[PDB]
Design a protein around this ligand. Structure first.
Ligand SMILES: NC(=O)C1=CN([C@@H]2O[C@H](COP(=O)(O)OP(=O)(O)OC[C@H]3O[C@@H](n4cnc5c(N)ncnc54)[C@H](OP(=O)(O)O)[C@@H]3O)[C@@H](O)[C@H]2O)C=CC1
Ligand SMILES: NC(=O)C1=CN([C@@H]2O[C@H](COP(=O)(O)OP(=O)(O)OC[C@H]3O[C@@H](n4cnc5c(N)ncnc54)[C@H](OP(=O)(O)O)[C@@H]3O)[C@@H](O)[C@H]2O)C=CC1
Lengths: 529, 533
């Protein structure tokens, strides 16, 4: 045969994936971990149809729309999470003389798993049309409204009107123009239907510019209609944070300063900005992922118990705890900027032709936040994010206060870890006895206890779009929430923009600046064993 | 000549194994069984106690406990490398034995386990065993025993002189005081060096007065660093599960109290009945048999305050302190049962035993509530349950945590912590977690069990509770042994109830063997803080 080279190739394929999984979890029980992971790798081997639904994607010619938004709508479609009569309209200034060719040669190529999904892509494209128009024309939005109304009137069922989800896959400088135009020309039919508007980051760049944008949108849409989306906040992580704590006496009781020594929230990527460091260059890693994404995780982790599990009680508590956070100081922040990797594989951040010469834009930051309330006073909250570092990894790590007595050096800090990348996991680390008579009471082991552990759908982005269709605003930042968050970070961001602290170089592929790990060790973190 | 002795040795070695296998596996064709085994056997093929001589003296060596449990446990420690290389084991009993080597190779070896693979080890082990036919109340015999022990102590290949002496009383308790007086008078360790430890078998009395009288009888001869009152059922693995999982860890240390725990149940369940020995059981009852001793020690370890160190006596100090916070159990806090024949007829009733007095009201089942009146536990019901001839074999601790009513409401329930010893070891929490992805909104949850145990690389076939206890005595660790003050406090918790029972004031409810027990018992548990899952 030549299939012998294919059987060997597959075998070596399963075994290398198993190798990487075992080497990540590092269980002492290698045999049973190998056993289950092979069994699991073989595994991988009417409320809402009641009304017409129209999705309008502004900026549909752009990078985000064709590479992420339309493919996510495709995945929701194939998962049967869109109603069967959904109509999707792309809206953009770009002339398109031939709409069917645009759908097939531009949009369809970025659809995922086109092999297995035979005939589903062409079915989905039937739900898509294109409107070439201006974002700031009231008349064009009246014309768009006539087109939407024709699609809503085709709905076969008895519910009148139609729901409209507007998706602003556009620079934020166009947001207020689009929302005014919708308000004046294309609100839902009076006979029935909601309007919801998905807004993309950046939501301003400091307290004053973000407040200006919110003030510009609020004449047109209220906080039950605006959905400020954070692509990275998956439903699974949020449920792990809320349910594992608040449904359980054991975890609820220790979620406080009497029991917790340190909290770290960490967002790491091996990729750099190598492609287009240029438009990262005026944002930097703090605005990019930490004032928005890591701070929402922080709010969900640190909030008081909400009055119910309803969306706005949860957002109420996110706002309440964020208000207890002192503005971060320049003394509590260490910045990095990555250079070329030791092996030359990854060029340095400045070696990008789209990055201005002499840029001091930070690609790495670690900072300490202080939450000054009864539950959290004195507990270090460390946020860390970095581009081009040693691994792809996103996790929460809670370190509990050590029980010095009576085990002494035979014990150490308990931990609770909630990981989103490279795979979902949630586990605790505690001291246990060692089985067998070889060990007296002082012979212990630091043991990991997995609540969940996945190998490396709908994804997080798709779950948020689905959340907006279902009217669930939990994972979206509210207007008041956003202002408080910007007030935590803006004094620091101003100090950085004045050069008061400056990034330390680090080679792509390392952990980052050595000073960042020194800062972490100085702010209450302790390494296991 | 060397090979002639080596050959006969090997032959006798195979023969001893075969005889043991036939005597134990009781085949009706002896000839066929010997042949199948013989061919199969062909196919089958610390520095501190290396330092001084060790002598283990087993009194009552002729008896049932000695041959069936104590010597085989000693064999298992020998194979696990847990006895010093030149250890000397002396069986001491009144029974005349005209042929000691026959006793060692036919009577003792019959009960050694896994002779298939350990037969040559069994022969090595028996070279360490001698037999002393003697009286327990003889000054002169104990002088003679001391001379035997000293001769072999004094030949020891090692740095320190003298020798450590471990005495095991595999005897009725009525003999303890006399044999202890004899040891103290004539067979204490040489003054030049060595400790003495004495393992005492149960029962330790049968109420406060009788138990105190026995302790008062023993204390002129051995202090509490010398007496080891053994409970065979309290294994090292459960005790470390109780102590380490809590006190080494912030997470469990912080919820181990009445602000967090709604109720605690400690349960000892057997499917077997009294198995034709109902007369022996009839004068003991289930409370004295397993509850005042075994379950109460588990309770003390679960409920105690943090010990000042992990030293054995610091732990025993805390066991004593928490037991002193418990009022004597009253009959309104107790439900008793006595088992009748199983519905299928496979288990005869307790009263159908011919050795059981007619009209006996002896309890074979009991559930009771104990209150620990202190800051950590005030208001927390502690339920002890023990039963013969019930629906399953099961020994566990179950801790129910106070429910988190808000915000999940009926989408959550009480967390639980379970520590299980039988029929297999386990330790886990039951908690409420999200249900994967999909429709599942925040309020869609399920209960899952989070294992709390360390999973080692190879399957650890760790020894039984009994052998770990003998090892602990050999190493000088009294943690799992009941101390004299602890014993008295425990009897005072239970004796007023045992008096009420012996006065007829509470009379067992019948229940068929194989059921859970009297239905009044499950009602009692439901009325005292437990909630079904
Ligand atoms: N993966 C991604 O692409 C990322 C997306 N984002 C955010 O998502 C949103 C869209 O991202 P992306 O597609 O990359 O952005 P683009 O800058 O590529 O804009 C998308 C579309 O918007 C129109 N557009 C661009 N500039 C203007 C302008 N001044 N006035 C009117 N229309 C304009 C263009 O379509 P036309 O000319 O046809 O009208 C363009 O094709 C932005 O808010 C962005 O900050 C942030 C992080 C990464
Ligand atoms: N598996 C078991 O058998 C269990 C027993 N125990 C306890 O262990 C101890 C011994 O158990 P077990 O072997 O069954 O008891 P036995 O009644 O069988 O006595 C053990 C030995 O002690 C001697 N003996 C018996 N009665 C007397 C007496 N009045 N005076 C002097 N010697 C006597 C006998 O040896 P000799 O005549 O040769 O001197 C006997 O063989 C007891 O305290 C028992 O309650 C606890 C756990 C389980």
């Amino acid at each position: 045969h030549a299939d012998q080279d294919a059987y060997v190739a597959d075998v070596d394929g399963i075994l290398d994936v198993l190798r990487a999984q075992v080497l990540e979890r590092k269980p002492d029980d290698i045999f049973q971990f190998i056993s289950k992971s092979a069994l699991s790798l073989q595994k991988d081997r009417d409320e809402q149809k009641s009304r017409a639904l129209t999705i309008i994607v502004f900026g549909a010619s752009g990078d985000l729309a064709k590479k992420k938004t339309f493919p996510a709508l495709f995945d929701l479609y194939c998962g049967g999470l869109l109603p069967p009569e959904v109509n999707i309209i792309g809206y953009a200034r770009t002339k398109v003389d031939d709409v069917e060719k645009w759908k097939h040669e531009t949009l369809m190529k970025y659809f995922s798993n086109l092999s297995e999904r035979g005939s589903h892509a062409e079915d989905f494209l039937k739900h898509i049309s294109y409107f070439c128009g201006a974002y700031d024309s009231v008349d064009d939005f009246k014309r768009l409204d006539a087109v939407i109304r024709e699609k809503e009137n085709a709905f076969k069922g008895p519910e009148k009107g139609g729901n409209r989800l507007f998706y602003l896959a556009l620079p934020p400088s166009v947001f207020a123009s689009v929302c005014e135009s919708i308000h004046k020309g294309a609100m839902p039919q009076e006979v029935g239907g909601w309007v919801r508007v998905i807004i993309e980051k950046p939501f301003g760049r400091d307290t004053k510019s973000s407040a200006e944008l919110s003030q510009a949108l609020e004449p047109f849409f209220d906080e039950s209609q605006l959905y400020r989306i954070d692509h990275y906040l998956g439903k699974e992580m949020v449920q792990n944070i809320i349910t594992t704590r608040f449904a359980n006496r054991i975890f609820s009781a220790v979620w406080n300063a009497s029991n917790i020594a340190c909290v770290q929230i960490t967002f790491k990527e091996t990729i750099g900005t190598e492609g287009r460091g240029g438009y990262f260059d005026n944002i930097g890693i703090i605005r990019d992922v930490m004032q928005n994404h890591l701070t929402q995780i922080l709010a969900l982790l640190a909030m008081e118990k909400p009055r119910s599990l309803d969306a706005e009680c949860i957002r109420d508590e996110k706002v309440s705890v964020l208000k207890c956070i002192e503005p971060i100081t320049k003394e509590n922040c260490v910045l990095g900027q990555y250079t070329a990797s030791a092996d030359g594989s990854i060029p340095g951040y400045l070696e990008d032709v789209t990055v201005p010469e002499g840029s001091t834009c930070p690609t790495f930051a670690v900072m300490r936040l202080n939450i000054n309330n009864d539950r959290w006073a004195g507990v270090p909250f460390i946020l860390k994010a970095g581009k081009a570092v040693e691994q792809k990894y996103v996790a929460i790590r809670i370190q509990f206060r050590d029980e010095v007595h009576p085990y002494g050096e035979a014990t150490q800090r308990n931990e609770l870890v909630i990981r989103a990348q490279p795979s979902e996991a949630m586990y605790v680390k505690i001291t246990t006895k060692v089985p067998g008579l070889s060990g007296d009471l002082r012979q212990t082991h630091q043991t990991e206890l997995d609540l969940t552990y996945h190998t490396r759908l709908p994804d997080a982005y798709e779950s948020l779009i689905n959340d907006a269709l279902l009217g669930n605003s939990t994972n979206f930042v509210r207007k008041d929430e956003l202002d408080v968050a910007w007030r935590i970070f803006t004094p620091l961001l101003h100090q950085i923009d004045s050069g008061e602290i400056k990034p330390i170089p680090y080679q792509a592929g390392t952990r980052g600046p050595k000073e960042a790990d020194e800062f972490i060790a100085n702010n209450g973190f302790k390494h296991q064993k």
